[PDB]
Design a binder for this molecule. Structure first.
Ligand SMILES: OC[C@H]1O[C@H](O[C@H]2[C@H](O)[C@@H](O)[C@@H](O[C@H]3[C@H](O)[C@@H](O)[C@@H](O[C@H]4[C@H](O)[C@@H](O)[C@@H](O[C@H]5[C@H](O)[C@@H](O)[C@@H](O)O[C@@H]5CO)O[C@@H]4CO)O[C@@H]3CO)O[C@@H]2CO)[C@H](O)[C@@H](O)[C@@H]1O
Length: 93
């Protein structure tokens, strides 16, 4: 149901800035990701109803962005890890 994301990064104030099910975009720079139980990863869990989808781009809280070469990243309900351009399900590998 909720969208949970693990994101690999060295940035110290990483943010995910997203639009949930095609609605309003978050206010910039977005929602900050918290330090995770996995070396080099941060995590956020975005609350969402069944069958939800978000569009996201990630940033350092300041304008260095990771936006999947301008296309942004898509996520569905469930857990995912974004590592170096690539989404995989579940928690970090
Ligand atoms: O509101 C209309 C708009 O909404 C959605 O945009 C969202 C983006 O898809 C999402 O990535 C995020 O955008 C970030 C972006 O990732 C980050 O790189 C930075 O953007 C830079 C551009 O990369 C840069 O090229 C330049 O942008 C120019 C753009 O090239 C030109 O084509 C024209 O559109 O003017 C743009 C800006 O005036 O500068 C910006 C920095 O100013 O920052 C972006 C966030 O500020 O967030 C967007 C929502 O905030 C839609 O998906 C998008 O297609 C729609 O047009």
């Amino acid at each position: 149901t909720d969208i949970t994301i693990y994101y690999k990064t060295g940035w110290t104030h990483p943010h995910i800035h997203y639009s949930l099910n095609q609605g309003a975009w978050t206010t910039l720079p977005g929602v900050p990701l918290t330090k995770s139980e996995y070396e080099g990863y941060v995590k956020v869990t975005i609350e969402a109803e069944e069958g939800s989808q978000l569009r996201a781009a990630f940033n350092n809280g300041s304008g260095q962005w990771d936006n999947n070469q301008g296309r942004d990243y898509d996520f569905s309900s469930g857990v995912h890890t974004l590592a170096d351009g690539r989404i995989l399900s579940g928690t970090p590998k």
